[PDB]
Write a protein that binds this ligand. Structure first.
Ligand SMILES: Nc1ncnc2c1ncn2[C@H]1C[C@H](O)[C@@H](COP(=O)(O)OP(=O)(O)OP(=O)(O)O)O1
Ligand SMILES: [Ca+2]
Ligand SMILES: [Ca+2]
Ligand SMILES: [Ca+2]
Length: 341
DNA sequence: GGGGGAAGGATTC
DNA sequence: CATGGAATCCTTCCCCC
């Protein structure tokens, strides 16, 4: 069982440099401007030139400018990044039939066939990196190991523009030395929760009573970490199918007014429907981000597909139910369509 | 005593 | 001051063998 994981370096920013090579070498910051005021919004991502000064994904654009006022600030162009990503995902398909497109810039390849050991694997990794750089001029990081989790962890250790193999002898020691927070799927909340239980390394999950563990992080997460520490994790690489499509936008001012929110809601619906492109949803959810950043949603499942007209009608009703409950002002609003026919 | 949906929410990348 | 898209996994009904 040999897994090769490919992760594109500072993707959005790298794409912008590809589209304008003169940016190469300068700090580049891809932003999502919300139009609330001059420079309101957040950083989608940034290149390493900017990253070394503390400018990274998630920080307010405003804070990024205080740190690097002379960096290059570019608005996010999602559409473009997706097409570039697709072309790269297609190249990857030429190296294995078993492929899992995990996100817009990640992919796992099951190369248990194409190769018979970590040597051929490491070389197949360079063949792949070299090929992507050559055809799309995009540097990526490769991680190779016994499974998806460790192949991804391996990539995390080598980025940017790297390649690393985590062999069967190195996995065993990581299960003992690796900070459990660096484990994929363990975010700040799960991490700052395993500590209260006394779990700082994967190995620690083996000396605690399952039932206690389950009650703290849930059954799935439980069995997940246990199977990894017990070196038994082995999820198959499989192509995921889009199960939902949607869009959430930011309003200029926080509001509780229906007619003030509608415009944003309808715009989210129009964009979502465009993206559906022939797919017909039976379920619709209206999502609202309140002023204190809490996420509230209301949805309905119909016994048939939802026409754009029905979506408009149903969304307002759902938006009203949200306002009837939480009396908090709404900051962001949008919709999500799922349960395709 | 449990299957199978459906909802509202939680957490991650 | 802090955007945005989508998957998985909870917890709680709910209807009803
Ligand atoms: N907080 C975010 N907001 C909006 N878009 C994001 C955010 N984080 C990541 N993305 C999008 C754009 C990133 O270029 C893309 C890939 O992220 P990754 O997590 O792949 O970061 P990079 O941006 O790839 O950094 P790196 O080289 O460390 O992997 O996903
Ligand atoms: Ca990634
Ligand atoms: Ca990446
Ligand atoms: Ca983490």
């Amino acid at each position: 069982m040999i897994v090769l994981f490919v992760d594109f370096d500072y993707f959005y920013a790298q794409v912008e440099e590809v589209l304008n090579p003169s940016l190469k070498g300068k700090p580049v910051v891809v932003c999502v401007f919300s139009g609330r005021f001059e420079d309101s919004g957040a950083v989608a991502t940034a290149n390493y030139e900017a990253r070394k000064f503390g400018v990274k994904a998630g920080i307010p654009i405003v804070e990024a400018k205080k740190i690097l006022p002379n960096a290059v600030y570019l608005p996010m162009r999602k559409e473009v990044y997706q097409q570039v990503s697709s072309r790269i995902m297609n190249l990857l398909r030429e190296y294995s039939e078993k492929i899992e497109i995990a996100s817009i810039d990640e992919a796992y390849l099951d190369i248990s066939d194409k190769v018979r050991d970590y040597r051929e694997a490491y070389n197949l990794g360079l063949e792949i990196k070299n090929k992507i750089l050559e055809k799309e001029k995009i540097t990526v990081t490769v991680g190779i190991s016994k499974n998806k989790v460790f192949a991804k962890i391996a990539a995390d250790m080598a980025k940017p523009n790297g390649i690393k193999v985590i062999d069967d002898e190195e996995v065993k020691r990581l299960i003992r030395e690796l900070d459990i927070a660096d484990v994929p799927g363990i975010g700040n909340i799960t991490a700052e929760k395993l500590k209260k239980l006394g779990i700082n390394k994967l190995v620690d999950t083996l000396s605690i009573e399952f039932d206690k563990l389950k009650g703290m992080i849930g059954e799935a997460k439980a069995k997940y970490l246990i199977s990894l520490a017990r070196d038994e994790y082995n999820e198959p690489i499989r192509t995921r199918v889009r199960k939902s499509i949607g869009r959430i936008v930011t309003m200029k001012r926080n509001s509780r007014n229906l007619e003030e929110i509608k415009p944003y809601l309808f715009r989210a619906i129009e964009e979502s429907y465009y993206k559906l492109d022939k797919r017909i949803p039976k379920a619709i959810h209206v999502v609202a981000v309140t002023e204190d950043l809490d996420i509230v949603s209301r949805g309905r499942t119909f016994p048939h597909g939802i026409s754009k007209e029905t979506a408009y009608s149903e969304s307002v009703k759902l938006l009203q139910k949200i306002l009837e409950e939480d009396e908090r002002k709404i900051r962001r609003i949008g919709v999500r369509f799922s349960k395709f026919i």
